[PDB]
Design a protein around this ligand. Structure first.
Ligand SMILES: CCCCCCCCCCCCO[C@@H]1O[C@H](CO)[C@@H](O[C@H]2O[C@H](CO)[C@@H](O)[C@H](O)[C@H]2O)[C@H](O)[C@H]1O
Ligand SMILES: CCCCCCCCCCCCO[C@@H]1O[C@H](CO)[C@@H](O[C@H]2O[C@H](CO)[C@@H](O)[C@H](O)[C@H]2O)[C@H](O)[C@H]1O
Ligand SMILES: CCCCCCCCCCCCO[C@@H]1O[C@H](CO)[C@@H](O[C@H]2O[C@H](CO)[C@@H](O)[C@H](O)[C@H]2O)[C@H](O)[C@H]1O
Lengths: 146, 751, 194, 49, 48, 49
């Protein structure tokens, strides 16, 4: 009691950072978070669908997009925490019978998603350095993420 | 190389060390490499330091002169000579303890404090000398004079703290400036008071000659050399004193008429307060201009470097210009990189240097703008530098229109141009400009995914070919002189300058066949943004504007807020972001700072006078000095900037001091059985001389800041005439009105 | 009221006090910070990331956007803006409430940025992300110059980087040395795609 | 061994001190932290994966 | 650790990039890296 | 613990100009021999191998 919350968080963050490479790859890809507990609950506000028009994941996403960051910018509010369904994801629900029918492994489809859902650094035409009196610098656009 | 200092650093120590280090390093420079100190703004604070130091000496000399003329003893003048430096120099230690600093604001605070410290010394030494002129001895007259003033000295210290320290508790940028002024003055005031109770009376007891004991070494020669002047000034001063006594008697007879004139003048104070246009921090020549070049959208950096070199050469041929510091590719929006834009910082020759009338920062900038107007490959404008690096606009707004509903870059741009399109109607708003640009030319590349995969070509292979050739992948590091340097591969210059160079790039299919992207991709022209700015995690377009400086910001921002509520389409809201968003958060402390400080001064005075009404005799006088100052600035048609406001504050403090001593003197005379009328007149006559001494000291200090043409005398005279009128009014209103208030309040005390 | 009695009778005592006042004032004079203005501009943290070749929209949404998602909601944050440029650079400026300690804010922003970091493209991660407290106070500008064109911009920047920058950066109250100009030396491989 | 003699004779001075005490308290009243309890739960840090 | 790597290789491909990034931390008195033949790399950054 | 023969100094010869590790040792050994030829220092040892 009386230890400073912010320095304590910083020390634990340094230690967790040291540990990070010992973690399995997947935990690394999803990420680690290290945060000071703010034990003082001022109030709890619910987002609600009073006639079931919109579901829990919609409501959590709306909270995340429109509400959470404004509330978190109120003075003296140290933390806004969402409690409820999961945030949005693009789910692909594999039919493993069908995947085998085309003689494919789940690994194969996952590789396809990595191949075809990816941003592109499409380049720049006429960028520096260029030789003649090249008139324009044109960046390139190309759809990479779905 | 921009060197940036840490908080609580020493600009001067750093600058000297940089110059010494550079001089040491130039000794290793290969022939053909050199250094230049291009911009060294620390010189500014250096001049401010000289400004204080010189102003202090002038002031000390002046007070000595005033003392010699009035008290006609060279020995009396040692009292300010030591007291003033001890107070001012001593202020630095308390300034350190509270973690302040020597900045331009605090130095200005000190120069204003010089007046208060000098007044303190005058009050103590004049009182002792006056008692001596009543035939007392130095030790006995010092005792009596200190019993007369030591209570008022403590009370005035408290009153000055109560006026100034609340100012340090304001919010935001204004608060951060006043904090410097007020803390410096308050410390000096407390220290000077302490000296006023210990060191000044002890000095005057050991140094003032009583009746008898004359000639010693210098007094005899001074009388010999200046006796005619002494006798004449005493004659005219005597005459003025009795006419003033008559005037006080006249006003005290027509006290009701005086009250009427005072109510009129309070009205005039409100009117002139609203007639003089407001200001915040005036425009200072910072010894450079910023010229911006914007070429046609999407132009190449080589085109920009040619425009930038032309601008620089033009500037270098312009008089008063010292250097052209050029950056082709530097964008004003963020100091980030653009192909079609660049900046030349035109550094000017030193202010005292061949800058003359027509050769000034505004003049240089106007000429450069005219000459650059004949550069037709680009839009060029040269602008004056910010007065304080880090805040800009100085009485204007900037806001961010935000795409909160995935409305796209295009619809957000349409919304912002529609907002500018409704707002230039007429709400006093000005030339609202934006920097959000979505019509820089670009190339769109369409990859037929199925067709690529039928040709055996992987879509990742297509994109990787595009990146490495057209976007230049970073591969790994290589070592050179033990240091790492990055190998980067990219298509060569000739092979990427041109849209269909895309089509000649070849990837390979699974079979081993080089498929060209001419067969799997289409390249089309399009338009887009060059810089995407995302504000508060929303893609956002800035618009900035404002009213003229004689209009404030709140009405303008109300206009834009109403217009946006009328004009912004669905899913496109807006936010404020800068000085304006920070102000909107502030609860404008001022509405509690000034009431608190007047209440505090009232209480301090109430304790000193043991009266609930006599404090008014002081407080009711302070509007008049405001009037005196404001009409002064109004008569020069300047603005009420924070510098002139802290000047206004010191003027109210000085007028309060004079009133407090007048009223306390009248009170003790009345306690000696004088009627309020004769008490008021006798007190005013008693205090007339020291008040005149201080006023004359200031006005002679104002005379050199008025006869200084050809030099850096814009702000010198600008505060000069203001101080002349402020002093005239402070003295006139104090001497002609405090007696009137005393009698009015005193005969409205019981029954 | 004779608070002045003790000293009127003892001028040496009174002088001793004022000389002490004076001596302390001179000491502080030589210990104080010197600057043109006080700290008036609210402190900010700056995050910098390159994504070479990527379009400003790609940078805005696949680089800047995740970092802001992680940064958003840091304590004492006044506001934040990211800027992605066609030269491939991404710069986030997180501004904090006046009176925030710059160092605590930078540590918070660094943690958030690390949380987001695996969300970045491999190329942006490989070039590296940096988070630093902005030092808004410009003391002076020093240029290296080639007055007879013996050497070019990249040479001059490299020289500054190797011999000059760190000496300056070590001075005393110097918080940051920032180089503005051409790029540093690199091994370039210019492919003839034909 | 008694200070109150001074203030008995100068009631306005005594009032001034007390009114200043009152004003200080009112300013502070509007600046204080407000919560149901003080910081009694020991601070903790939380790591998630 | 860089097991098996030569001290010059560690000093130049491990120590040098780390120190180029570390260089310029606030109130840094000086720094030294040390690469050993057993594959270990140790940097000591001394502050004011 | 942490002082290292305080009645003494320690210094750093730095390869700033891409000389070799071998040429760096050459410079240090020339410095040690020339410091023995100046009669004001004591014994100078290194650990550089
Ligand atoms: C009696 C009224 C006096 C008004 C006083 C106004 C404030 C005066 C500030 C005193 C300066 C304190 O800060 C001090 O400034 C000096 C120069 O003055 C800096 O000095 C630096 O610049 C000068 C330039 O000439 C060099 O000669 C010096 O060797 C170098 O260190 C010190 O490193 C710093 O410690
Ligand atoms: C920021 C908050 C500050 C809170 C404190 C404010 C207190 C202000 C103190 C001011 C000083 C009061 O000091 C008080 O001065 C008066 C002068 O009018 C003196 O009183 C004087 O007037 C009486 C009249 O009866 C004379 O007879 C007497 O000879 C003389 O001394 C008191 O003996 C002294 O104690
Ligand atoms: C030697 C004498 C020294 C004199 C000292 C004078 C000190 C004066 C301090 C003025 C303080 C201004 O500072 C400001 O105070 C006000 C007072 O509530 C607070 O303001 C608050 O008050 C209202 C009251 O309804 C709240 O509802 C609201 O949320 C908020 O605006 C600010 O959060 C604080 O920043």
């Amino acid at each position: 009691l009386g230890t400073d919350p912010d320095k304590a968080t910083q020390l634990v963050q340094n230690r967790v950072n040291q540990a990070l490479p010992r973690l399995p790859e997947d935990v690394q890809r999803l990420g680690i978070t290290t945060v000071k507990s703010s034990p003082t609950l001022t109030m709890v506000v619910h987002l609600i669908s009073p006639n079931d028009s919109y579901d829990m994941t919609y409501l959590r996403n709306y909270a995340l997009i429109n509400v959470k960051d404004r509330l978190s910018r109120i003075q003296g509010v140290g933390q806004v925490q969402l409690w409820g369904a999961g945030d949005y994801a693009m789910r692909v629900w594999l039919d493993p019978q069908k995947v085998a029918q085309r003689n494919l492994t789940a690994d194969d489809v996952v590789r396809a998603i990595r191949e075809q859902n990816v941003q592109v650094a499409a380049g720049v035409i006429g960028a520096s350095p260029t030789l003649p009196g090249t008139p324009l610098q044109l960046s390139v656009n190309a759809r990479g993420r779905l | 190389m921009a060197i940036n200092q840490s908080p609580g650093a020493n600009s001067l120590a750093i600058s000297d060390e940089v110059r010494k280090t550079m001089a040491e390093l130039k000794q290793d420079f290969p022939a053909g490499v050199d250094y230049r100190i291009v911009y060294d703004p620390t010189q500014f604070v250096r001049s401010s330091i000289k400004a204080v130091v010189h102003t202090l000496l002038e002031a000390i000399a002046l007070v000595v002169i005033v003392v010699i003329v009035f008290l006609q003893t060279w020995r009396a003048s040692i009292i300010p000579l030591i007291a003033v430096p001890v107070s001012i120099v001593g202020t630095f230690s308390l300034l350190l303890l509270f973690g302040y600093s020597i900045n331009a604001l605090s130095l200005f605070g000190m120069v204003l404090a010089i007046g208060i410290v000098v007044d303190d010394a005058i009050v103590v030494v004049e009182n002792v000398e006056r008692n001596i002129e009543n035939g007392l001895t130095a030790r006995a007259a010092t005792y009596k004079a200190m019993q007369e003033v030591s209570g008022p000295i403590i009370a005035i210290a408290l009153t000055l703290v109560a006026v100034f320290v609340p100012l340090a508790f304001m919010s935001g940028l204004t608060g951060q400036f006043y904090k410097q002024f007020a803390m410096t003055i308050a410390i000096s005031t407390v220290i000077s008071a302490f000296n006023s109770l210990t060191l000044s009376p002890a000095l005057s007891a050991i140094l003032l000659k009583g009746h008898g004991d004359k000639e010693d070494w210098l007094t005899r020669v001074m009388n010999r050399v200046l006796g005619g002047f002494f006798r004449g000034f005493n004659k005219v001063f005597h005459r003025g004193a009795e006419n003033y006594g008559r005037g006080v008697r006249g006003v005290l007879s027509r006290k009701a008429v005086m009250l009427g004139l005072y109510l009129v003048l309070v009205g005039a104070t409100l009117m002139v307060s609203k007639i003089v246009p407001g200001g915040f921090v005036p425009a200072q020549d910072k010894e450079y201009l910023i010229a911006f070049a914007q070429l046609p959208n999407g132009a190449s950096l080589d085109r920009t470097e040619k425009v930038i070199r032309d601008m620089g050469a033009i500037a270098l041929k312009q008089p008063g210009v010292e250097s052209a510091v050029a950056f082709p590719g530097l964008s004003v929006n963020g100091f980030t990189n653009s192909s079609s834009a660049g900046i030349v910082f035109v550094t000017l020759k030193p202010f005292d240097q061949r800058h003359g009338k027509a050769l000034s920062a505004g003049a240089i900038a106007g000429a450069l703008n005219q000459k650059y107007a004949a550069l037709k490959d680009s839009f060029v404008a040269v602008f004056p530098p910010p007065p304080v690096l880090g805040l800009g606009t100085l009485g204007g707004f900037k806001m961010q229109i935000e795409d909160r509903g995935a409305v796209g870059y295009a619809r957000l741009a349409d919304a912002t141009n529609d907002f500018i399109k409704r707002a230039q109607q007429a709400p006093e708003l000005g030339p609202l400009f934006t920097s959000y640009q979505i019509n820089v030319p670009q190339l769109n590349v369409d990859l037929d995914r199925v067709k690529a995969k039928q040709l055996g070509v992987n879509v990742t292979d297509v994109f990787d070919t595009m990146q490495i050739y057209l976007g230049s992948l970073y591969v790994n590091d290589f070592n050179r002189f033990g240091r790492v340097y990055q190998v980067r591969v990219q298509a060569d210059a000739p092979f990427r300058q041109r849209a269909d160079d895309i089509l000649q790039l070849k990837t390979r299919n699974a079979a081993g066949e080089m498929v060209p992207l001419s067969s799997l991709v289409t390249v089309s022209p399009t338009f887009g943004p060059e810089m995407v700015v995302r504000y508060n995690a929303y893609t956002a377009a800035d618009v900035n504007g404002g009213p003229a400086p004689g209009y404030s910001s709140g009405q303008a921002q109300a206009a834009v807020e109403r217009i946006a509520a009328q004009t912004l389409p669905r899913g496109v809201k807006f936010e404020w972001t800068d000085l304006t968003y920070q102000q909107i958060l502030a609860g404008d402390s001022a509405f509690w700072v000034f009431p608190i400080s007047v209440l505090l001064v009232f209480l301090v005075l109430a304790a000193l006078y043991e009266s609930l009404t006599l404090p008014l005799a002081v407080i009711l006088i302070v509007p008049m000095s405001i009037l005196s100052a404001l009409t002064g600035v109004w008569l020069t048609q300047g603005d009420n900037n924070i510098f002139t406001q802290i000047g206004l504050m010191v003027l109210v403090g000085l007028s309060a001091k004079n009133a407090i001593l007048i009223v306390e003197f009248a009170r003790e005379l009345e306690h000696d059985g004088k009627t309020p009328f004769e008490a008021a007149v006798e007190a005013s006559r008693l205090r007339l001389r020291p008040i005149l001494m201080t006023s004359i000291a200031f006005i002679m200090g104002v005379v050199p800041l008025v006869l200084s043409t050809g030099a850096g005398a814009e702000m010198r005279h600008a505060m000069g005439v203001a101080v002349f009128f402020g002093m005239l009014g402070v003295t006139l209103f104090g001497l002609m009105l405090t007696p009137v208030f005393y009698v009015v309040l005193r005969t409205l005390a019981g029954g | 009221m004779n608070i002045s009695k003790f000293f009127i009778d003892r001028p040496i005592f009174a002088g001793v006090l004022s000389v002490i006042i004076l001596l302390a004032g001179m000491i502080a004079m030589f210990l104080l910070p010197i600057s043109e203005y006080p700290e008036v501009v609210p402190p900010s943290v700056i995050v910098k990331a390159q994504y070479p070749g990527a379009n400003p929209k790609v940078i805005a949404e696949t680089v800047a956007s995740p970092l802001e998602e992680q940064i958003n909601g840091v304590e004492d944050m006044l506001y934040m803006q990211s800027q992605a440029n066609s030269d491939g650079n991404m710069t986030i400026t997180v501004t904090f409430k006046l009176g925030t300690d710059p160092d605590k804010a930078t540590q918070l922003v660094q943690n958030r940025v690390n949380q987001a970091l695996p969300r970045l493209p491999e190329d942006v991660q490989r070039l590296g992300i940096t988070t630093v407290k902005s030092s808004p106070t410009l003391t002076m500008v020093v240029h290296l110059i080639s007055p007879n064109d013996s050497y070019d911009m990249t040479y001059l920047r490299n020289y500054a980087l190797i011999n000059v920058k760190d000496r300056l950066s070590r001075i005393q109250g110097v918080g940051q040395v920032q180089l503005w100009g051409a790029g540093d030396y690199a091994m370039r491989v210019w492919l003839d795609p034909q």
